[PDB]
């Protein structure tokens, strides 16, 4: 316990992080010198770092850094169109997290986050069916993104951990800051027999991960949290969260009791058909749970305060039914100096729900007017894509976007379309004017059901890694896979 294990950890860190960085630096210097030699040869023959100062001095590894959005400089003067388009290749990012070959086990609900130089990953292993199967385990991985000899970026796991008492956990998510990872999990009320009572609320658990240290556990329950509405059940959005200062931010959804009047948001285009005000009634009933007006499914911002003190507290802000549809999984993003929220589609609207807020407040959130990612898989809804007819249906799927500009005018996403056998998937980039640049991906794979994207700066370019869940062949169990691509800027002139 005293000698072998720390030295084994040191060897793992040195062989998986340090040496690849040294070799990559050597290669970079070599190429720079070759370019200089070529320039000197052409010129001669006939017939120190203030910017890096206070920027990379405190970083352990300098392979990746937070994204810095592209600018249209140079593109502007001639009549021109500045656009960003996806790379041709979709390289593998192998061994992002441990896996198994058992046939009775399904890997589900991935959570992926990228910090300054570290990444946080989470997965659930459920016996039998993916959705209503017993939670066998919940696995968390903390690692680093490093540059090996391959074309795309690679991942080096540094710490693998298993959440204690996985049976009494409703759902949970991860967040990543510099040299730090956070996992917020929600537990349920268990009593009498050891088997937990499904879909109940009993507080939270907060786990803090740092490199070459031990995980720290905090119990937030009782008087340490104050939700604005009485919640019977609370789930944490699988998208993840962020850290700003000493405080963290997540998204939550669950059953909440109310007694006020309900006028659910009803936006749709020329549905016609029956109409006559029955669409409003359908919209109001959709947000309800089991018909009763008392209980709704609500979305909420969740804020964790004073994480460094050692006594974290939690507050929340609930979206009114008039400003949202039925609750679902979500994600919190930091864009520039302002923040964004993505809400997955559950129910009839199957358009993209993204919003931008400067202070993470319910009353100061504005929603994008874009429909580009439309969920066409894992839905029982029958309404057409052109016009979304209010109906009662359930959609269970997750496809988020990553903003490539301060106002989220540019973004990147992944589209999945059902077919006779499995699905067909593409990666797309959406620009200001309304154009989509698409490349088909994963042709060999049978089916893909979800995707989450996180981008960063790698070798003076924007690179993104997408974590998907699916089946390589028809009879294989569902697993989770990671791939990498690049976003390249263009200045087309018409």
Ligand X SMILES: *[C@@H]1O[C@H](CO)[C@@H](O)[C@H](O)[C@H]1NC(C)=O
Kindly list the residues in this chain that would bind ligand X in the complex (CB under 6 A). 78-79, 493-494
From the list Na ion, a copy of itself, ligand X, none, pick the one residue 394 interacts with, judged by a Cβ distance below 5 to 8 Å according to partner type: none
Q: After which residues is the chain broken (C to N over 2.5 A)?
A: 47
Which of 63, 64, 67, 110 touches a copy of itself by CB under 8 A? 110
Q: Which of residues 320-339 bind a copy of itself (CB under 8 A)?
A: none
CB of 89 to a copy of itself, least distance (A): 5
Q: Which residue from 339, 260, 251 is spatially nearest to 298, judged by alpha carbons? A: 251
Q: Any contact of residue 94 with a copy of itself (CB under 8 A)?
A: yes
DSSP category for residue 318 = E
Q: Does the protein bind a copy of itself through residue 51 (CB under 8 A)?
A: no
Quick check: 336 and 243 in contact, CB under 8 A? no
| Torsion angle of the four alpha carbons 431, 436, 439, 443, in this order, in degrees rounded to the nearest 10 | 130
> Which CB sits closer to a copy of itself, 100 or 221?
100
Q: Does 89 bind a copy of itself (CB under 8 A)?
A: yes
Residue 431 interacts, among Na ion, a copy of itself, ligand X, none and using kind-specific CB cut-offs from 5 to 8 Å, with none
Other Cβ atoms closer than 10 A to 304: 24
Which residues in 446-475 contact a copy of itself (CB under 8 A)? 465, 467, 469, 473-475
**Residue 27 binds a copy of itself (CB under 8 A):** yes
> Least distance (Å) from ligand X to the CB of residue 330?
42
Query: Is 23 within 8 Å of 14 (Cβ atoms)?
Result: no
CB of residue 283 vs ligand X: minimum separation in angstroms?
Answer: 44
Closest-by-Cβ residue to Na ion is 34
Q: Which residues from 27-66 bind Na ion, rule CB under 5 A? A: 33-34
Count of other CB atoms within 10 angstroms of residue 90: 18
> Which of Na ion, ligand X, a copy of itself, none sits in contact with 323, Cβ below 5 to 8 A by type?
none
CA distance 185 to 273: 44
Residue found under tokens 């460094």:
308
Q: Please check whether residue 93 is in contact with residue 156, taking contact to mean a CB–CB distance below 8 angstroms.
A: no
Binding of a copy of itself by 144 (CB under 8 A): no
Among 11, 197, 230, 281, binds a copy of itself (CB under 8 A): 11
Query: How many angstroms separate the CA atoms of 185 and 172, rounded?
Result: 4
Residues numbered 150-209 forming contacts with a copy of itself, rule: CB under 8 A: 150, 157, 160, 208
Distances (CA, A) of 323 to 259, 263, 388: 17, 9, 17
Nearest to 373 by CA among 381, 383, 362, 385: 385
- Name residues contacting a copy of itself, limited to 235-294 (CB under 8 A): 246
Rounded to a whole number of angstroms, the minimum distance from the CB of residue 427 to Na ion is: 36
The three-state (H, E, C) secondary structure of 72-130, written as one string: CCCCCCCCCEEEEEECCCCEECCCCCCCCCCCCEEEEEEEEEECCCEEEEEEEEEECCC
Instruction: Say if CB 167 and CB 145 are below 8 A apart.
Output: no
Q: Over the range 179-198, which residues count as b (16 or more CB within 10 Å of their CB) and which as e?
A: ebbbbbbbbbeeeeeeebee
User: Virtual CA dihedral for 193, 199, 205, 209, nearest 10 degrees?
Assistant: 110
Site for a copy of itself in 396-455 (CB under 8 A): none
Q: What angle do CA 86, 458, 69 make, to 5 degrees?
A: 65
Pick the stretch among 327-335, 387-395, 451-459, 476-484 that binds a copy of itself (CB under 8 A). Answer: 476-484
Q: Least distance to a copy of itself from the beta carbon of 355, Å?
A: 31
Q: Which does 180 bind (CB under 5 to 8 A by kind): Na ion, a copy of itself, ligand X, none?
A: none
Give min distance, CB of 241 to a copy of itself, in A: 19
Tokens standing for residue 246: 């000493």
Tell me which residues in 57-76 interact with a copy of itself (CB under 8 A): 57-60
In the complex, what is the shortest distance from the CB of residue 34 to Na ion, in angstroms, rounded to a whole number?
Answer: 3
398 strand-pairing partners: 450
- Residue of 292, 308, 382, 421 interacting with a copy of itself (CB under 8 A): 308
Shortest spacing between CB 77 and ligand X, in angstroms: 10
Residues that bind Na ion (CB under 5 A): 33-34
């Amino acid at each position: 316990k005293g000698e072998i294990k720390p030295k084994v950890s040191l060897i793992n860190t040195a062989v998986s992080v340090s040496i690849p960085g040294q070799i990559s630096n050597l290669q970079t210097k070599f190429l720079q010198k070759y370019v200089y030699l070529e320039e000197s040869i052409t010129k001669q023959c006939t017939c120190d770092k203030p910017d890096d100062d206070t920027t990379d001095d405190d970083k352990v590894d300098t392979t990746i850094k937070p994204v810095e959005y592209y600018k249209p400089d140079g593109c502007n003067k001639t009549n021109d169109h500045f656009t960003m388009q996806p790379g041709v290749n979709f390289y593998t990012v192998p061994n992002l997290g441990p896996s198994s070959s058992s046939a009775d086990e399904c890997y589900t609900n991935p959570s992926f986050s990228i910090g300054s130089s570290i990444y946080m990953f989470s997965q659930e292993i459920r016996k039998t069916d993916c959705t209503t199967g017993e939670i066998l385990s919940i696995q968390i991985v903390l690692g680093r993104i490093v540059d090996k000899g391959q074309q795309g970026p690679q991942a080096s796991p540094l710490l693998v951990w298993s959440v204690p008492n996985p049976k009494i956990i409703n759902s949970c998510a991860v967040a990543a800051g510099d040299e730090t990872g956070w996992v917020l999990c929600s537990v349920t009320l268990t009593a009498a027999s050891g088997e937990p009572i499904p879909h109940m609320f009993d507080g939270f658990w907060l786990y803090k991960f740092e490199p070459d240290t031990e995980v720290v556990a905090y119990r937030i329950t009782g008087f340490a949290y104050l939700l604005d509405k009485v919640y019977d059940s609370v789930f944490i959005g699988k998208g993840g969260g962020i850290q700003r200062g000493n405080d963290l931010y997540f998204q939550m959804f669950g059953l909440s009791r109310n007694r006020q009047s309900i006028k659910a948001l009803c936006e749709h285009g020329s549905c016609l058909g029956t109409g006559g005000g029955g669409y409003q009634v359908l919209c109001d009933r959709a947000v309800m749970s089991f018909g009763s007006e008392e209980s709704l499914i609500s979305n909420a911002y969740l804020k964790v305060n004073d994480v460094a003190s050692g006594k974290p507290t939690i507050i929340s802000q609930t979206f009114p039914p008039s400003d949202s549809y039925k609750g679902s999984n979500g994600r919190i993003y930091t864009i520039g100096e302002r923040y964004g929220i993505y809400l997955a589609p559950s129910s009839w609207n199957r358009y993209l729900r993204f919003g931008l807020t400067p202070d993470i407040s319910v009353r100061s959130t504005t929603w994008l007017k874009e429909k580009d990612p439309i969920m066409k898989v894992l839905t029982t809804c029958t309404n057409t894509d052109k016009d979304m007819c209010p109906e009662i249906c359930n959609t269970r799927g997750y496809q988020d976007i990553f903003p490539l500009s301060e106002d989220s005018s540019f973004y990147t996403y992944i589209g999945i379309t059902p077919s006779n056998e499995g699905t067909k998937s593409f990666v797309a980039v959406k620009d200001d004017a309304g154009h989509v640049a698409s490349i088909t991906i994963l042709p060999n794979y049978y089916s893909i059901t979800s995707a989450t994207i996180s981008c960063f700066m790698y070798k003076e370019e924007i690179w993104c890694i997408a974590v998907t869940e699916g089946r390589k062949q028809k009879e294989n169990p569902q697993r989770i896979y990671a791939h990498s691509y690049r976003v390249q800027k263009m200045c087309f002139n018409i």
